Design a binder for this molecule. Structure first.
Ligand SMILES: CCCCCCCCCC(=O)OC[C@H](COP(=O)(O)OCC[N+](C)(C)C)OC(=O)CCCCCCCCC
Ligand SMILES: CCCCCCCCCC(=O)OC[C@H](COP(=O)(O)OCC[N+](C)(C)C)OC(=O)CCCCCCCCC
Ligand SMILES: CCCCCCCCCC(=O)OC[C@H](COP(=O)(O)OCC[N+](C)(C)C)OC(=O)CCCCCCCCC
Ligand SMILES: CCCCCCCCCC(=O)OC[C@H](COP(=O)(O)OCC[N+](C)(C)C)OC(=O)CCCCCCCCC
Ligand SMILES: CCCCCCCCCC(=O)OC[C@H](COP(=O)(O)OCC[N+](C)(C)C)OC(=O)CCCCCCCCC
Ligand SMILES: CCCCCCCCCC(=O)OC[C@H](COP(=O)(O)OCC[N+](C)(C)C)OC(=O)CCCCCCCCC
Lengths: 293, 293, 293, 293, 293, 293
């Protein structure tokens, strides 16, 4: 908070009394279903030290959640998106540098609660025959309760070097049919990984017996639309005013297969089966303030 | 957050010191009961890279929740809106492209809570006859609690290609008569799908025995009014300054039938029975900045 | 959110650098107790496409909650407002159209919580005679908890056509004497519909035995004041610049009668007994920007 | 709160009607994986008393979470970041001084709840033989509940002297596999420190049996990006207008080793095993208002 | 709230259309580890009645939490900061006065909840021999629950006279090892004051057996940074325009000693053992609007 | 809310385009420890109807919590502030009037919750000898829960007449040693009023056995600083432009005495023992817009 040091709010920011030449580039990769788009902005504030360029890789990545293979009613497969990734890179010999990037790793908290209870009890028992009985008792109780919030997909910021910065979205865990949350490594000796399992012992065809995409999380089927910001600074006295950038939109899928053993379905997951990458190279012209490709 | 990179807030946005020519077009489709409307705005900022056009498909889609067929008191049917859809498409040969779209798939979270309890107990029992008894005990308890919020209708963003983008609204599940939430695939061996069932074993006429539309969710009967935004960019040097768009407002209904077997009502649901589509083609004139049709 | 597409906030709105000629018309209908009022505003922004007119039907509708008929102490009646309605309509041959309307159907959510508990137990029992006993036990528990918020009166938006748009307020359910919520269709074999019942088996006069209006919801007795907004657009090249509108403020009452059978009171409800409508026709003059009548 | 003393808000702040010359310097230390960056701003308000300079050490520090050594399946090690540190220092003979620093130690609160319950009980027991029995009882209960929120990593502000100021981020405790929170000093006689333990008695290779980095907290693997602000004031009449600063980005790792004793895995932690420091010296030129190096 | 009297918000404040000459003075007291700093501002609004001066004693006070003395493994001591204080004073003969001071005593609230429960019970017992038994029971329960939030350190405003005003921060109570909150006066017959005790009956060296500073509250080890505001008014017609102020940063430490009696550790606390004061005298020159020393 | 009537926000307020001459007067009453201060503002808006003057009686009142008398170890007393009061009055013959006053009586709410539970139970018992037993049971439960928040000190606004207006702060109730809240009228047959009691049956000296001021609420010891606003209007055509005001800062103390009967301490409270008043008379000069004294 800038106002917490007594500095008037907004004084230290950059971009006042200047003209910013924004832009936009959109490209669709039919092969991988990645509607990538980048929205840039050239800021050159005279009071600043270096020329600036903010790249916002909005785009969108499809889900690709479908049953790829079926072999009769005995067994069938399924491919689902294990994690989405997007990164920006620069040539090793380039002179520009990565300055900032908004979505960053943040610390996570958890509640905690301790309970202690003392008790006392006493009753008097009697019957018709005149018998009289008594009972005196006591009890103690100690309790620990711990609660926290865990999302289905967890965004991460990979260690950003000077030249390349990249994010990542992975599959934390999911709740199926209102049952206990499952994850890729979850295992049960009888049924196995029940992640995307419709019925434990249904009699339908194996390919049919898969969780309906609507029931599952949206990102699995309808894709994930990133919103990431990075800022690139280039010295104003550099001999060359042209730079090249590479943007990647890789998506990683997994193989989930359920198998009918004798009576019930058995689910197995094979992480990191396929990976799809869609890299496009853009060219930056600092002098003209336009990025084209 | 633009201010989190130290850039002055609002610097990177587009639309400053420019005149935007808005508009409006309203049309009602009596056949399907879809009061469709589009509210557009032409933004051509000199500091930007391409001409812009934002389309907000506000409109409204009716519910169409009524008992379509009745056959005596033995059985009767009912049609309800399973899902609402709206999408924008462009001709394959067009040069414009889809840039953005507001309502997007978002990650969902869930609470979690683990509990552990230790116990101790002891009592002394005595009677008139002088008998003295004792009791010492202990117990342990482990508990997992998981809570999350699930809406009745869940909006989704279908995988947006470069040329076409479309949303979708589906029926998650509903609570009937304060009873457990039901959904399309819910089944009970005795009664069956009790989704829109008034009384389990009422003696009234079959057509009468249906959940009152007021009790159910509003969207089922009174319709759903969308609010979706998309932005279309067209290069300023293109030879042709005219483009055509298509807007669709399809709505999908289901068939719900309850049947009197011997004593109680039995309910069955047949998903995706009917679909109603209302597509209108608009023409865009970038040079004059007006969309008409 | 306009700022979520990178457009500067407020750019796409209409009404900048223009003069709006507001107005006001108030009329009271003594027969039906409806203090109806409309607050209009003519907006004609040169950058827009059509002339605009926003109508805000503020007004107010009385409750009319009273004991209409009494027949000795054996039985008596009561009329209460089941639902309030207000709608705007245009002549079929008119050229203007309905564009927007603020209060719209919204999706409703519900919480959900699943619980699972394991237990263990063991005690050692002994007495004076040296007898020693043991006990080992275990238990499991499964719990589903579902919570949601339900208001007394639920506003709805009837399917809006091009020419007419109307809202509606209905009676969801009410809590009486801190007892379980009741509604119009609620029934109990012994007492019946106990909605507005003071005492189950009081000995007072039948007319007296009714819930005090203060205890009940406010809208029942003191009326409901609507706040609804609609916008009408008319093409700027139309031959005729005059339009007629109709505004209706209908209110629906129900008959609630309690009857002394032998020992306790019995309550019965007869929905949709009376309806009161108060329609006034206004005239719109686009050229002069004034609505009068 | 400035407005709480009746002073108009923002009156006492500094930075109005002045030009601030910002800047930026980025450097990457390949050896230690620390993408350090500093964003400075020279403020010289004529109404103020001294020249000002705010340094925001944004940067980023990698996680470095990996299995460094493995010796067959009997045992293997692991190094994880115990704490991240960053500090600014000035030469002892310098004339500038440290004025402020935003992230500061803050007081922490805890909930508290006391419960007291009285009880009464009575039952009548009878059998076919005509025997009649009674039971009267009472009980009391006292309960203390205390709850508070404890984050995984806890930022601290080391005692700031006049010349040097430094922050610190340490490892509070973590929740593993939904089990009770663990910390560095946690110990269990059977298993030991179960902090980063995959399975208690799994049969896999020792190196394999480690908690997946995705499951653990993000900062452990993907690094921690600091955001700390400090302000340096230098008198405007000083003979020398040049100052030197030192910025350090030390990171401390620990050694976590699990050992297979006879049947189950045993985990041991050795705090403060390695420390990595990356110090860079910057030069400040007050007269020209530029920091370079 | 100024707007609650119908006065336009901000009308009654002071500081509009005037120039405020701020300042800053920083000094570090190596002997006591108190990085004291004062940030002043001279406001002389022509519409006001007196000259104004707001002093914000930001500064910072070190924690000084360490084991001062150890005598073998039998016993050892510890000194921790019991309370931090800071006050401003004026000479008795001075003419200026204290007007305001932000952080002020505030009323504290507590929740409350009363519970009442009625019960009923009945079971039918039978065996093979045809014996039939019954049981009818009832019970009542009354419960009072009271919850409130209590911070570790509680800031107070000492009774402010005309000439001197001073704040105070004291040690409310702390939670150790997730156990019941402890305070200075807490006592246990077996162990004693268990405030900063690592293990109840550990076998390590006495000096070693102390709570790790990281586990404890931050203010204990890393110090407390105050933020207090006071405003001084001086008449504009006074003969002398020079005033002297004194600022004190006293810190009070306590002695905590744990002692090995025969088997377990015993902890004893001796409140108010040492006090450290660091007073500096500043000179105020109203005519020149500068405070120097 | 002004914007809820369609009036542009802030239109109806007073104070626009005018100059307000503020002020300040501070006086300390050594005898009673009341640092009283008044902050006035003369507003004369030409569009208004009367001259305005807002008086904000900020000031501060000391706590005066101490053991006044002790008589050996058998008994001792204590005086604590029961209630703080501040009021403004005008001479009866004056022409000015009291218009407004911010802190006003506000309605207080309470939660409420009704619970109902049905149960069922059944078990099968068997032993080695082949005996088989059964048990079928049921139970019902009704519960009322009511929760609300009650502060320690409750501010009130005494009935404001035309000439005088006064506030009041009283002692609602307090929580001692985490035990049930106590108040002035609380009584216990064995111990008595245990409000400020350290230990029930401690053996220390009577004067020593009193609750530590730090443990109690802050206002008891460190005093209460009021913040109250009132506005006085005087007609602009009045013959006399001078008015006199009286400001009072009375504080009421109570006598709390604990007495050693035979084994335990007994506490008694005598409400309204002493009262301290400090009234100062100010003179208002409307023509010159200055209040002096
Ligand atoms: C895997 C299990 C590892 C052992 C964990 C030990 C830490 C938990 C301590 C514990 O049980 O809580 C403390 C309780 C409650 O009493 P306290 O709060 O200590 O008050 C003393 C009253 N008392 C003498 C009648 C017992 O007092 C006790 O009963 C404590 C007795 C000494 C420690 C052993 C307790 C066994 C707990 C499983
Ligand atoms: C479908 C069921 C699959 C098995 C799930 C195992 C995971 C749950 C572990 C569990 O029951 O919780 C741990 C408990 C509580 O004690 P801990 O927290 O382990 O402390 C040890 C104290 N104790 C030796 C007296 C037991 O200690 C135990 O009693 C654990 C014993 C070893 C695991 C088997 C527990 C059976 C749970 C159904
Ligand atoms: C109207 C009632 C329709 C039936 C509803 C079935 C769905 C509910 C399943 C259920 O009861 O929850 C699962 C429980 C808990 O254990 P799980 O979480 O399955 O862990 C297995 C441990 N166990 C073998 C010792 C039981 O394990 C069981 O006991 C499940 C046994 C198989 C399903 C039948 C359960 C009967 C529930 C009324
Ligand atoms: C490690 C344990 C140290 C001792 C802690 C003592 C402090 C806790 C006091 C306590 O147990 O709570 C007070 C209860 C509840 O009654 P009160 O609220 O005192 O009302 C009196 C009614 N009664 C005479 C029928 C009992 O009344 C009592 O039963 C209090 C009796 C005197 C104190 C001893 C209680 C033993 C608690 C472990
Ligand atoms: C240290 C203890 C001091 C005594 C505290 C007395 C204040 C608490 C009163 C109390 O126990 O709550 C009221 C209950 C519940 O019934 P009520 O709400 O009074 O309804 C009457 C129904 N009844 C006749 C069947 C009892 O009705 C009763 O059982 C109240 C009977 C009269 C007061 C004595 C109750 C004993 C409480 C410890
Ligand atoms: C100081 C006490 C004054 C009396 C307060 C009466 C008001 C409370 C009524 C009450 O107990 O709650 C109603 C319950 C629950 O059943 P309901 O919700 O009435 O459903 C009827 C089912 N049942 C016939 C099997 C009982 O049904 C009953 O058991 C009600 C029976 C008639 C009223 C007497 C109940 C006694 C309560 C202390």
């Amino acid at each position: 908070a800038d106002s917490d040091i007594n500095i008037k709010t907004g004084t230290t920011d950059i971009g006042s009394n200047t003209t910013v030449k924004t832009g936009d580039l959109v490209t669709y990769d039919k092969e991988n279903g990645m509607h990538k788009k980048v929205f840039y902005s050239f800021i050159d504030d005279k009071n600043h030290n270096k020329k600036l360029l903010v790249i916002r890789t909005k785009g969108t990545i499809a889900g690709q959640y479908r049953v790829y293979s079926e072999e009769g009613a005995n067994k069938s497969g399924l491919a689902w998106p294990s994690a989405f990734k997007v990164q920006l890179q620069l040539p090793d010999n380039e002179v520009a540098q990565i300055s900032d990037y908004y979505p960053r790793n943040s610390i996570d908290t958890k509640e905690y609660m301790s309970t202690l209870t003392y008790g006392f009890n006493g009753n008097v028992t009697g019957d018709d025959t005149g018998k009289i009985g008594g009972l005196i008792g006591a009890n103690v109780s100690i309790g620990h309760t711990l609660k926290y919030v865990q999302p289905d997909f967890k965004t991460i910021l990979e260690s950003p070097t000077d030249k390349k910065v990249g994010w990542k979205v992975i599959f934390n865990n999911m709740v199926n049919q209102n049952w206990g949350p499952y994850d890729r490594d979850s295992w049960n000796p009888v049924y196995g990984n029940q992640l995307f399992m419709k019925t434990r012992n249904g009699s339908m065809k194996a390919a049919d017996n898969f969780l309906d995409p609507n029931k599952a999380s949206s990102l699995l089927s309808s894709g994930f639309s990133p919103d990431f910001a990075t800022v690139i600074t280039m010295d104003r006295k550099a001999s060359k005013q042209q730079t090249n950038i590479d943007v990647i939109y890789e998506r990683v899928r997994d193989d989930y297969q359920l198998h009918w053993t004798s009576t019930n379905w058995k689910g197995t997951n094979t992480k990191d089966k396929w990976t799809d990458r869609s890299s496009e190279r853009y060219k930056i012209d600092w002098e003209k303030e336009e990025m084209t490709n």
